[PDB]
Enzyme design. Sequence first.
Site, PDB file in Angstrom:
ATOM      1  N   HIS A   1       0.772  -1.266   0.000  1.00  0.00           N
ATOM      2  CA  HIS A   1       0.000   0.000   0.000  1.00  0.00           C
ATOM      3  C   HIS A   1       0.804   1.320   0.000  1.00  0.00           C
ATOM      4  O   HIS A   1       0.251   2.403  -0.299  1.00  0.00           O
ATOM      5  CB  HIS A   1      -1.164  -0.017   0.969  1.00  0.00           C
ATOM      6  CG  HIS A   1      -0.775   0.528   2.349  1.00  0.00           C
ATOM      7  ND1 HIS A   1      -0.497  -0.364   3.393  1.00  0.00           N
ATOM      8  CD2 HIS A   1      -0.687   1.815   2.804  1.00  0.00           C
ATOM      9  CE1 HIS A   1      -0.218   0.406   4.533  1.00  0.00           C
ATOM     10  NE2 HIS A   1      -0.323   1.773   4.167  1.00  0.00           N
TER      11      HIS A   1
ATOM     12  N   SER B   1       3.179   3.207   8.449  1.00  0.00           N
ATOM     13  CA  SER B   1       2.931   2.130   7.406  1.00  0.00           C
ATOM     14  C   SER B   1       4.193   1.646   6.668  1.00  0.00           C
ATOM     15  O   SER B   1       4.988   2.497   6.205  1.00  0.00           O
ATOM     16  CB  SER B   1       1.946   2.657   6.296  1.00  0.00           C
ATOM     17  OG  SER B   1       0.623   2.613   6.842  1.00  0.00           O
ATOM     18  N   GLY B   2       4.322   0.340   6.471  1.00  0.00           N
ATOM     19  CA  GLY B   2       5.468  -0.224   5.749  1.00  0.00           C
ATOM     20  C   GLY B   2       6.596  -0.491   6.730  1.00  0.00           C
ATOM     21  O   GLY B   2       7.519  -1.262   6.432  1.00  0.00           O
TER      22      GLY B   2
ATOM     23  N   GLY C   1       1.489   6.877   8.619  1.00  0.00           N
ATOM     24  CA  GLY C   1       2.853   7.375   8.457  1.00  0.00           C
ATOM     25  C   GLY C   1       3.835   6.328   8.974  1.00  0.00           C
ATOM     26  O   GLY C   1       5.047   6.400   8.654  1.00  0.00           O
TER      27      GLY C   1
ATOM     28  N   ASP D   1      -0.165  -7.512   1.964  1.00  0.00           N
ATOM     29  CA  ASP D   1       0.330  -6.106   1.952  1.00  0.00           C
ATOM     30  C   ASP D   1       1.880  -5.988   2.162  1.00  0.00           C
ATOM     31  O   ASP D   1       2.404  -5.689   3.284  1.00  0.00           O
ATOM     32  CB  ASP D   1      -0.477  -5.257   2.986  1.00  0.00           C
ATOM     33  CG  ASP D   1      -0.193  -3.760   2.839  1.00  0.00           C
ATOM     34  OD1 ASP D   1       0.426  -3.315   1.821  1.00  0.00           O
ATOM     35  OD2 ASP D   1      -0.485  -3.003   3.797  1.00  0.00           O
TER      36      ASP D   1
END
Length: 223
Positions: free
Chosen positions: A40, A177-178, A175, A84
């Site tokens: 994402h 994320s990942g 923020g 994801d």
Amino acid sequence: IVGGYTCGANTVPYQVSLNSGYHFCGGSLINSQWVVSAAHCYKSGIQVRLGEDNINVVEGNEQFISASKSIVHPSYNSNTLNNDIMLIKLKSAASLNSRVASISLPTSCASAGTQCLISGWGNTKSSGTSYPDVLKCLKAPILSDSSCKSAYPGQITSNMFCAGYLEGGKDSCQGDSGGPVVCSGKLQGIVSWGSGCAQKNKPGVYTKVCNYVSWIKQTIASN
Ligand SMILES: [Ca+2]
């Protein structure tokens, strides 16, 4: 990160920031030339930033390397967030030391009750918006699948897990994320999604990296 603490400069040496003119997602360094993040987070024109603490000040340990190639998981579903995960290959190999290091991929899946460290530059508020300049950390347990699926009926797959606190207060956030979830020194999760942040009965949901090892290894061996 909501309800966490300031990690301290280069105490999380595998942490990356993905930059496209601004920080937009975290990531984890898994060897000198490869980063793992959330599908994402995919964008064209990524610059990977290693060795960061304050993302707004050049403090001396950074390496800014552009991405050569991005590979999103063949089965990624942006509506469900199933699978994801993505791989980013760096145009040149990072120079690895104590402050910039890779993290090991897991051999086993980690169980409920294991304590993990989650980190990122994401929003630090449950209500409202406030983005830190320095890296924030949270230690949080992995939750049972039972608890997870009872929190998010119909939404959790085999490739996800919950972590955090059902009482709320402490979570990752937009923020982050990942970014990494590391347990017992191995990369177990990637910050994926959640309902709001740090809300009661709505823990964070993480990509279950131990399901993708074979896919990561294969990929990196051929690209
Ligand atoms: Ca910096």
